[PDB]
RNA sequence: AGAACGCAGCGAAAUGCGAUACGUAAUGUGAAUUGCAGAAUUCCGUGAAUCAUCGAAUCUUUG
RNA sequence: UGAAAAGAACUUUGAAAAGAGAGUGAAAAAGUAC
RNA sequence: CCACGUCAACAGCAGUUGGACGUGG
RNA sequence: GCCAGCACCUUUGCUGGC
């Protein structure tokens, strides 16, 4: 609700986390580059690796999904 | 410091178990510096890792009767900065000064809800 | 499904902010698998455009410079004030 | 002469006129102090009168006027009537050119930067001259006369004005502290304060505004407090009476200086992190009143030159008998049916209501009006300042960010973006709030400076936070020695 | 008012909105710094009123 | 001579070129450090 | 740490300098650093400030192998002048540092006389000089630290 | 001014070897040191051509040179040596 | 009525009563080359080491590709470059590697024990034991007399309490010779330590029963005291290190479960 | 002149010579070293600063 | 160049002037 | 089995993982983590681990 | 190297390096392949 | 290579210079 | 595109030749 890791995210259904999530990577490709501005931040590891956390998760529920038929 | 006997590393390699092996909840163990007898009473237990605004004073050192919150402690070199001296030099180019946490007394702490709750239930090895 | 994001990122230089002045020219680093049809895609559903010209060579950086040219009528001074 | 050649810049005639060019030796810091103050005290002779004998006897010279005459820096009938109106004006007029973007100048090459300050002063005195002319177009002085010694108080104007802006420049090259500028502006406000609250009061009659009761502050607290020497007594609260309450201006000056003084120590805190730790660290506020002090001095000075919209350059044409394209439709000033008599229906709404009295609330609509137009000036000023360099938005945190990802390998990295989205909301509404709580500081009391206090305050302590800040922080003379001592390292 | 000047004014709310708030200490620097200020105010402004009496009383 | 072609094996090496460790010093300030490079 | 090393002084009548791994020879600045000496500062000086004009050099008392045959000087005990002012420079870089030391002392100004001086080798810079058949012999460039006290007498 | 005739017919022949130019312009310089009494000699581009033109082998023999003084004296001494 | 009949003496203790006889097996000449044989035949079979390593060798191909120029080949070696290697390194010689045999494991050492001297060995430790002057000279200090070697109860094996093995050690006196085991001396041993060598602690007293060990969960621990049995019991028990004389305590029930045996060995001197 | 290798690289590569021939002023040599740039060096050959033989 | 001197002559120079006229 | 080259805010040295690129997750712990400068996150219950998981979702190029 | 980097502030001198004096600490001929 | 900034090491001396060192292109 | 003249501080403009 208030953003933005993990029990919002881990069990959200999945269309509306996928949108969400190519502009949350909007937000850091407008911040690219440089516009890495300096920074570091904290938020800009956070959310390329929350891409990467979230893209485990997607292609996780297909995956698991895929062994349940 | 760690009870005998299994492994009977002899040894400057159980040393090193010390030194480089276990991160944080097992620098538990060696984050722990004696209670007082008020709060042995209080809780019934003996020590306790430290907070970093549990209140302690230094006891064997050169520096060996000080009160202080700790400022730092360290995970990987197991050592307590208490604020502070510190030592400065003129312009505040500035000194930690670190200590070793059972060499240590704690006076005042902080203790916090389910914190004293997992401490009081058990111990071990649950982890 | 199988493919790559093209854009890793845009560079920014002496050389490559000079051609935005010139003739509405961004330049990017792109991936090292890069085809020039999916640079003239991605351009244009990141900045809404179309693109009059895709050339690419490689850089030192590893990353292959991927040099295009936009639409006069997209302008190309407040859409780089967007990146 | 003309000759051929294909020229339309004055070349010959410029170096025949005898106008100044500047220091020459300074030294620091007793020696600074020293002619910091020497200066203040050839201003001080702003005792003397002007020649002029018919004009000095009978008239003694009309009404004194109280709009002009802090963002000046002068004072009515001496030497330096113009004091710093016409070298701000050229920097209004070149703020104009360059901020409406109409002649496009980068001022970190060297070449066109000192092109633009030499312009400046020369454009200054250019200023001086016409503003010469129209000040003796206004009527000012209750003699209008055909060319005799109508031109040689003109000049005498000019060539002592010509030595208040070689002292604005003296001070400002390194001769006194601080910007020459900054000084006359402070020590004029100065001037009014304890003439007008400490004064000295002396028994006389007269029809016309004469100086019978200064002295505010010791005649109202003295006549509360007991008796003196002088046989007094009794409570004098308020009344809207024309015999003054004296309770009005010793309320209104400290009223000011209060509200106005409180929103000098309002700065916008922006956070730094590590001190060579793990955390936050210092809290850094900035200053946005020293920024905004030269863009509601604009905004301040614009108010009274506009043709279609002030006093001074409206009073000429009022003034002027002839009726054509120019005509009073700009404004009348004129006697007035009315008890007290100033303009009776003019353009200039733009022009502020507050005098040494009460403030008016009989009008909202020319308040409304007064203070959009401020606003909007201010706000005009604001992105002028901020394109015509400074520290620039734009190449600082383009310039520090290259500079320090390549300081050799590498470094991490900075604040510089994190100060790049708060500082435009802090600079340009800075410069608009500041304007705003100008106008309600005019409007508690007071003029002759009521805005000119305000921004001489204002600009005066967070110049002082930025000089405290380069004291402790980067070292010299210091003012750590107060407190500091002991940071840590982790 | 449109999309871009409530961008802007409710960004310079913000500014508005965060005063750093009065501290008596810092009320010690005002009162001082005022004060040092009404000493200049006063050498000076009675300097130029008290010898302009003397020129209207040589002067008829 | 004849390697598997070809553009490509050229420009992996270019990059190891720039890649290539140059340089500095402030980790050796805080490590544990025994000399190198 | 370091110096005298024939520690008699005291600090409240000396002055002191040093140079420090400086690339200029150890076998020329020894015979320097004994014949300096001893002599005021400005005596010092002003033989090293003539040598670099014409006044040789300064006497060579043990390194003294040949060369041809020699010569004209001076030669006051010696017979086996040289030039090199590269040793000239470095000395003359350690007395004007000795004497700005020695101006901020307070003390002064007959008194002096160098009391020690020794050169320490701060090592040997170790290159080749190419010859036959892909064998390389050594070559050294050489360089020297030094230390400089001096004392009131 | 004072006018000199160097004598060159001194040594000039008698050196070569190969470098007869270099050593010359010094023989020139601490000639024109003694008789006009000096520091430094400028020494023009004016003479460095007058050496160099019939290249070493290769001198025109005794020049006649022009060189002008001096009181200044030491801070920033006027010796031409060319043509004043 | 009387031989070698003993007092016995209780832990209670302040004693009553009397014991059964000192054996004849406490007789025979003491024989110190004997005992210094048998202690170091015994700590030889666990002994072995480590070394330097690489290879125990032998990077390092080779047979003698040694290459003239001067001062010959010395002697020797071969493989290979601006190293290492010369010799080197593979040595010895070695100013890098090896030395001329690696520790050697390899190197079968041992003492097989026979039957016959393994009991004569014992007798021989158990006739070590009954002396009474040397106690001083090995370097513990007896307070006490007589009833020497001691003898205490049964009551021993029970505890446990940590308190009654302090009631235990006053009535041995003894005590203050575990009191010297628990002071420095006692110290900090280097690298010397992990071997065994040391840095610079003494023994103290040994307890002996019988049907037991007894060896009980808390007999184990204590400063310097030893505990074991007469059916198991070793030469580095009754004097450890080989210099003879250990105080040694006993407890009753010792005669008779020594004095009966087949096997056959038997005093004689 | 001094630093000005490149200022005889680039001042020969604007007129387009082998760098021998190209000019450069001994009074403005210190406003030639102020170019750095190839439009700044278009403005000194204009004005005559630097010529070509 | 002028002269801070020169100002500061001027000016009081003027003041002088100024005041009887 | 093994190996090339990438990845980072930094990247000397080590190994952690693959264009999602020292990632994180499921069991789990408790006041400090990101080596450090710096930029930040936490602190009376959802920050942070190999203390332990022969346990795991992702998985370029070469073999 | 040291318990802890406290890994040497500040001042004078020197083109810079460094030197002189001074600071830290139990000890600096413990001042950085210590 | 090109551009800019430097002299601790490297250049067979030396240095205000570099193919070196540092950083970008 | 190259070369030359006049105007201009430059960026430029006009005229002529190849």
Same mark, same amino acid.
């Given at each position: 609700?208030a953003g933005?890791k993990?029990y919002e995210?881990?069990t ?5 986390l996928?949108?969400?999530?190519v502009?949350?990577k909007?937000?850091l ?8 501005s300096?920074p570091?931040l904290p938020?800009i ?7 990467a956390?979230?893209?485990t998760?997607?292609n996780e529920?297909q995956?698991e999904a895929?062994?349940?038929? | 410091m760690?009870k005998?006997?299994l492994?009977?590393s ?10 480089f ?10 984050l ?5 007898k008020?709060?042995?009473?209080q809780?019934?237990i003996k020590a306790?890792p430290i ?7 230094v ?7 000080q009160?202080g919150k700790?400022?730092?402690?360290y ?21 930690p000064i670190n200590?070793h946490?059972?060499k240590?007394?704690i006076?005042?702490?902080?203790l916090?809800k389910?914190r004293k709750a997992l401490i009081?239930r058990?111990?071990?090895?649950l982890? | ?5 093209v854009i890793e990122?845009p560079?920014t ?7 935005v002045?010139?003739?509405?020219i961004?330049?990017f680093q ?15 559903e990141?900045?809404?455009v179309?693109?009059l010209?895709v ?5 030192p ?5 991927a040099?295009?040219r936009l639409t ?6 407040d859409?780089?004030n967007?990146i | 002469?003309?000759?051929?050649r294909?020229?339309?810049?004055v ?5 025949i006129l005898?106008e ?13 102090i020293?002619?910091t103050i020497?200066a203040?005290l050839?201003?001080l002779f702003?005792q ?5 004998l018919?004009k000095?006897t009978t008239?003694?010279?009309?009404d004194?006027?109280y709009f002009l ?5 002068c004072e009515?009938?001496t030497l330096?009537?113009?004091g710093?109106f016409?070298n701000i004006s050229?920097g209004l007029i070149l703020?104009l050119l ?6 496009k100048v980068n001022?970190?090459?060297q070449?066109?930067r ?6 400046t002063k020369?454009?200054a005195?250019?200023q001086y ?9 206004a ?8 060319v005799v010694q109508?031109?040689?108080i003109?000049?005498?104007?000019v060539?002592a ?6 002292l604005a ?9 601080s910007?020459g500028?900054?000084?006359?502006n402070?020590?004029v ?7 007008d609250?400490?004064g ?6 007269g029809?016309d505004?004469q100086?019978?009761?200064?002295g505010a502050?010791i005649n ?5 407090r007991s ?5 007094i007594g009794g409570?004098?609260s308020?009344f809207?009476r024309d015999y003054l309450?004296?309770?009005?201006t ?9 509200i ?6 309002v700065?916008?805190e922006?956070?730094i992190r590590?001190?060579?730790a793990?955390?936050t660290?210092?809290?850094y ?5 020293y920024?905004?002090?030269?863009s509601?001095?604009?905004?301040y ?7 279609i919209?002030?006093?001074?350059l409206?009073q000429?044409?009022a003034?002027?008998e ?9 404004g009348h000033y004129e006697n007035?049916?009315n008890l007290?008599?100033v303009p ?8 502020p209501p507050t ?7 009989q009008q909202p609509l020319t308040?409304?009006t007064?203070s959009?137009?401020?606003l909007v000036t ?7 300042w901020?394109a015509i360099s400074?520290?620039s ?5 383009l310039?520090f960010?290259d500079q320090?990802?390549?300081?050799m390998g ?8 994190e100060?790049?989205?708060?500082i435009?909301?802090?600079?340009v509404?800075?410069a ?5 709580i100008?106008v309600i500081?005019?409007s508690?009391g007071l003029?002759?400076?009521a805005?000119?206090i305000?921004?001489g305050i204002?600009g ?7 000089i405290?800040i380069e ?5 010299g003379q210091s003012?750590?020695?107060q407190?500091?001592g002991?940071?840590?390292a982790? | 008012?449109?999309?871009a000047?409530?961008?802007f ?13 009065p501290?008596?200490?810092?009320y010690?620097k005002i009162?001082?710094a005022?004060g040092?200020g009404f000493?200049?105010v006063?050498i000076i ?6 010898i302009?009496?003397?020129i ?5 | 001579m004849a390697?598997?072609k070809?553009?490509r094996?050229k420009?992996?090496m270019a990059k190891?070129?720039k890649?290539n460790?140059p340089?500095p010093?402030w980790?050796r300030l805080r490590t544990?450090?025994?000399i190198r490079y | ?10 600090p409240?009548?000396?002055?002191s ?7 200029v020879?150890?076998k ?10 001893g002599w ?17 050099a300064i006497?060579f008392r ?6 041809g045959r020699?010569?004209?000087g001076?030669?006051?005990?010696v017979?086996?002048?040289r030039?090199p002012?590269?040793?000239?420079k470095?000395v003359?870089?350690?007395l004007?540092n000795?004497?700005?030391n020695?101006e901020?002392?307070?003390l002064?100004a007959?008194?002096l ?5 020794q050169?320490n080798?701060?090592?040997?810079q170790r290159?080749?000089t190419?010859?036959?058949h ?8 050489s360089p020297?630290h030094?230390e400089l006290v001096?004392?009131?007498? | 001014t004072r006018?000199?005739?160097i004598?060159?017919?001194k040594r000039?022949?008698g ?12 023989e ?17 581009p004016?003479?460095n051509?007058?050496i160099w ?6 001198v025109?023999?005794?020049?006649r040179?022009?060189?002008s003084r001096?009181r200044?004296?030491?801070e920033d001494?006027?010796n031409?040596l060319?043509?004043? | ?5 003993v007092?016995?003496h209780?832990?209670?203790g302040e004693?009553?009563a009397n014991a059964?006889?000192?054996?004849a097996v ?7 080359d004997?005992?210094?044989?048998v202690?170091?035949?015994v ?6 080491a ?6 125990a060798g032998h990077?390092?191909?080779?047979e003698?590709?040694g290459?003239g120029?001067?001062?010959?080949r010395?002697?020797?070696?071969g493989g290979?470059?601006t190293?290492?290697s010369?010799q080197?390194?593979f ?5 890098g590697g ?8 390899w190197?079968?050492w041992?003492?097989?024990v026979?039957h016959?001297e393994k009991?004569?060995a014992t ?7 009954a002396?009474?002057?040397?106690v001083?000279a090995?370097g513990?200090?007896?307070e006490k007399?007589?009833?020497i ?5 049964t ?13 235990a050690?006053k009535?041995?006196?003894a005590?203050?010779d575990?009191?010297?085991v628990l002071?420095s001396?006692?110290l ?6 992990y071997?065994?060598r040391?840095?610079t602690?003494?023994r103290?007293?040994?307890?002996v029963?019988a049907?037991?060990?007894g060896?009980?969960?808390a007999?184990?621990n204590?400063?310097?005291?030893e505990?074991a049995?007469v ?5 580095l028990?009754?004097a450890?290190?080989a210099?003879?004389?250990?105080f040694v305590?006993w407890?009753e029930?010792?005669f008779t479960?020594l004095?009966?045996?087949?096997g056959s060995?038997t005093?004689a001197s | ?5 490149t200022?005889?690289?680039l001042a $020969?590569?604007?007129?387009?010579v082998?760098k021998?021939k =190209?000019?450069?002023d001994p009074n403005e ?5 102020? $170019?750095?740039?190839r439009?700044?060096?278009?403005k000194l =050959?204009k004005?005559?600063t630097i010529?070509?033989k | 160049?002028v002269?801070?001197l020169?100002?500061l002559?001027?000016?009081?120079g003027?003041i002088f002037?100024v005041?009887?006229?």
């Amino acid at each position: 609700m208030a953003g933005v890791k993990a029990y919002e995210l881990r069990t959200k259904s999945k269309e509306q986390l996928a949108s969400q999530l190519v502009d949350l990577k909007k937000e850091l490709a407008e911040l690219k580059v440089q516009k890495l501005s300096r920074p570091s931040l904290p938020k800009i590891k956070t959310v390329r690796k929350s891409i990467a956390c979230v893209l485990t998760v997607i292609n996780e529920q297909q995956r698991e999904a895929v062994r349940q038929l | 410091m760690a009870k005998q006997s299994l492994d009977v590393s002899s040894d400057r390699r159980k040393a090193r178990k010390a030194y480089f092996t276990a991160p944080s909840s097992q620098r538990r163990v060696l984050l722990s510096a004696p209670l007082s007898k008020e709060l042995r009473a209080q809780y019934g237990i003996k020590a306790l890792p430290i907070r970093r605004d549990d209140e302690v004073l230094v006891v064997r050192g050169s520096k060996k009767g000080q009160e202080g919150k700790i400022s730092s402690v360290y995970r990987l070199k197991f050592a307590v900065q208490v604020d502070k001296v510190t030592k400065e030099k003129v312009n505040g180019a500035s000194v930690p000064i670190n200590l070793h946490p059972s060499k240590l007394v704690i006076t005042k702490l902080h203790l916090d809800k389910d914190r004293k709750a997992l401490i009081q239930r058990k111990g071990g090895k649950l982890e | 499904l199988d493919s790559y994001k093209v854009i890793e990122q845009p560079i920014t230089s002496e050389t490559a902010m000079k051609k935005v002045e010139d003739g509405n020219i961004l330049v990017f680093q792109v991936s090292m698998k890069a085809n020039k049809y999916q640079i003239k895609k991605a351009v244009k559903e990141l900045y809404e455009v179309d693109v009059l010209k895709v050339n690419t060579l490689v850089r030192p950086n590893g990353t292959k410079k991927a040099y295009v040219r936009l639409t006069a009528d997209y302008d190309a001074l407040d859409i780089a004030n967007r990146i | 002469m003309s000759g051929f050649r294909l020229i339309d810049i004055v070349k010959p005639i410029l170096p025949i006129l005898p106008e100044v060019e500047l220091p020459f030796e300074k030294l620091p810091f007793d020696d600074k102090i020293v002619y910091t103050i020497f200066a203040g005290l050839i201003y001080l002779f702003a005792q003397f009168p002007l020649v002029g004998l018919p004009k000095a006897t009978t008239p003694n010279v009309n009404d004194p006027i109280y709009f002009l005459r802090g963002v000046f820096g002068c004072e009515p009938r001496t030497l330096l009537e113009f004091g710093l109106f016409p070298n701000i004006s050229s920097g209004l007029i070149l703020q104009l050119l360059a901020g409406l973007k109409v002649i496009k100048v980068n001022f970190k090459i060297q070449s066109d930067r000192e092109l633009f300050q030499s312009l400046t002063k020369v454009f200054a005195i250019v200023q001086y001259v016409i503003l010469t002319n129209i000040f003796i177009f206004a009527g000012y002085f209750g003699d209008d006369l055909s060319v005799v010694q109508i031109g040689l108080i003109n000049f005498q104007l000019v060539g002592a004005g010509i030595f208040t802006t070689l002292l604005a420049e003296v001070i400002d090259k390194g001769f006194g502290f601080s910007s020459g500028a900054m000084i006359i502006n402070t020590v004029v406000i100065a001037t009014n304060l304890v003439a007008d609250t400490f004064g000295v009061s002396q028994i006389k009659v007269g029809e016309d505004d004469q100086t019978e009761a200064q002295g505010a502050l010791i005649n109202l607290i003295q006549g509360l407090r007991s008796k003196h020497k002088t046989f007094i007594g009794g409570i004098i609260s308020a009344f809207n009476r024309d015999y003054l309450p004296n309770l009005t201006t010793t309320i209104i000056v400290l009223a000011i200086a209060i509200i106005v003084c409180y929103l000098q120590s309002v700065r916008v805190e922006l956070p730094i992190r590590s001190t060579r730790a793990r955390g936050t660290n210092n809290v850094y506020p900035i200053k946005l009143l020293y920024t905004g002090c030269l863009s509601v001095l604009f905004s301040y000075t614009i108010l009274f030159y506009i043709h279609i919209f002030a006093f001074v350059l409206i009073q000429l044409v009022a003034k002027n008998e002839p009726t054509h394209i120019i005509c009073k439709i700009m404004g009348h000033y004129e006697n007035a049916n009315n008890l007290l008599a100033v303009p009776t229906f003019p353009l200039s709404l733009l022009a502020p209501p507050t005098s040494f009295f009460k403030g008016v609330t009989q009008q909202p609509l020319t308040f409304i009006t007064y203070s959009a137009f401020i606003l909007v000036t201010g706000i005009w000023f604001a992105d002028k300042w901020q394109a015509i360099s400074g520290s620039s938005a734009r190449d600082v945190a383009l310039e520090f960010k290259d500079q320090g990802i390549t300081l050799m390998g590498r470094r991490e990295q900075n604040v510089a973006k994190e100060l790049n989205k708060v500082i435009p909301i802090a600079a340009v509404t800075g410069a608009s709030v500041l304007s705003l709580i100008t106008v309600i500081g005019e409007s508690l009391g007071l003029k002759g400076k009521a805005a000119g206090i305000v921004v001489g305050i204002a600009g005066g302590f967070s110049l002082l936070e930025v000089i405290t800040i380069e004291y402790q922080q980067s070292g010299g003379q210091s003012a750590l020695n107060q407190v500091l001592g002991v940071p840590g390292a982790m | 008012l449109v999309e871009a000047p409530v961008e802007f004014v409710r960004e310079g709310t913000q500014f508005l909105a965060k005063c750093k708030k009065p501290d008596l200490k810092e009320y010690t620097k005002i009162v001082k710094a005022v004060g040092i200020g009404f000493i200049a105010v006063g050498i000076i402004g009675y300097a130029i009123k008290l010898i302009h009496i003397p020129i209207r009383y040589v002067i008829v | 001579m004849a390697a598997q072609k070809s553009f490509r094996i050229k420009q992996k090496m270019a990059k190891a070129k720039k890649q290539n460790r140059p340089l500095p010093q402030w980790i050796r300030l805080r490590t544990n450090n025994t000399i190198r490079y | 740490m370091a110096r005298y090393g024939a520690t008699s002084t005291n600090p409240a009548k000396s002055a002191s300098a040093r140079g420090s791994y400086l690339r200029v020879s150890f076998k020329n600045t020894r015979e320097t650093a004994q014949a300096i000496n001893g002599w005021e500062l400005t005596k010092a000086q002003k033989y090293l400030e003539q040598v670099l004009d014409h006044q040789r050099a300064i006497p060579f008392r043990r390194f003294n192998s040949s060369i041809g045959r020699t010569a004209q000087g001076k030669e006051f005990g010696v017979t086996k002048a040289r030039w090199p002012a590269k040793s000239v420079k470095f000395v003359q870089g350690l007395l004007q540092n000795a004497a700005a030391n020695a101006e901020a002392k307070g003390l002064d100004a007959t008194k002096l006389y160098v009391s020690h001086i020794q050169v320490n080798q701060a090592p040997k810079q170790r290159r080749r000089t190419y010859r036959a058949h892909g064998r390389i012999n050594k070559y050294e460039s050489s360089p020297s630290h030094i230390e400089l006290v001096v004392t009131e007498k | 001014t004072r006018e000199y005739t160097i004598n060159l017919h001194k040594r000039l022949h008698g050196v070569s070897f190969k470098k007869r130019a270099p050593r010359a312009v010094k023989e020139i310089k601490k000639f024109a040191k003694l008789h006009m009494g000096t520091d430094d000699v400028r020494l023009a581009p004016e003479l460095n051509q007058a050496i160099w033109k019939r290249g070493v082998k290769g001198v025109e023999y005794r020049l006649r040179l022009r060189i002008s003084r001096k009181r200044n004296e030491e801070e920033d001494a006027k010796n031409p040596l060319f043509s004043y | 009525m009387s031989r070698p009949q003993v007092t016995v003496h209780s832990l209670t203790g302040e004693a009553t009563a009397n014991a059964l006889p000192l054996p004849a097996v406490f007789s025979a000449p003491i024989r110190p080359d004997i005992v210094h044989t048998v202690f170091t035949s015994v700590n030889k079979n666990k002994r072995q080491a480590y070394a330097v390593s690489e290879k125990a060798g032998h990077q390092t191909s080779a047979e003698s590709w040694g290459t003239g120029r001067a001062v010959a080949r010395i002697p020797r070696v071969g493989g290979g470059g601006t190293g290492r290697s010369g010799q080197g390194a593979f040595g010895n010689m070695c100013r890098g590697g090896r030395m001329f045999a690696p520790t050697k494991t390899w190197r079968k050492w041992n003492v097989k024990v026979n039957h016959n001297e393994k009991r004569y060995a014992t007798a021989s430790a158990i006739a070590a034991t009954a002396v009474a002057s040397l106690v001083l000279a090995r370097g513990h200090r007896v307070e006490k007399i007589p009833e020497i070697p001691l003898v205490v109860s049964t009551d021993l094996e029970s505890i446990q309490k940590t308190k009654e093995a302090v009631a235990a050690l006053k009535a041995v006196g003894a005590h203050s010779d575990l009191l010297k085991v628990l002071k420095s001396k006692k110290l900090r041993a280097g690298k010397g330590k992990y071997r065994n060598r040391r840095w610079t602690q003494r023994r103290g007293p040994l307890v002996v029963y019988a049907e037991d060990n007894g060896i009980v969960k808390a007999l184990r621990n204590v400063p310097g005291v030893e505990t074991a049995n007469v059916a198991s019991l070793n030469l580095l028990q009754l004097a450890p290190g080989a210099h003879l004389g250990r105080f040694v305590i006993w407890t009753e029930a010792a005669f008779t479960k020594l004095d009966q045996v087949w096997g056959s060995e038997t005093v004689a001197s | 002149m001094a630093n000005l290798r490149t200022q005889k690289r680039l001042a $020969a590569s604007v007129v387009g010579v082998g760098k021998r021939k =190209v000019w450069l002023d001994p009074n403005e040599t210190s406003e030639i070293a102020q $170019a750095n740039s190839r439009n700044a060096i278009r403005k000194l =050959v204009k004005n005559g600063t630097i010529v070509k033989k | 160049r002028v002269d801070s001197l020169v100002v500061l002559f001027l000016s009081v120079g003027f003041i002088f002037s100024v005041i009887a006229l």
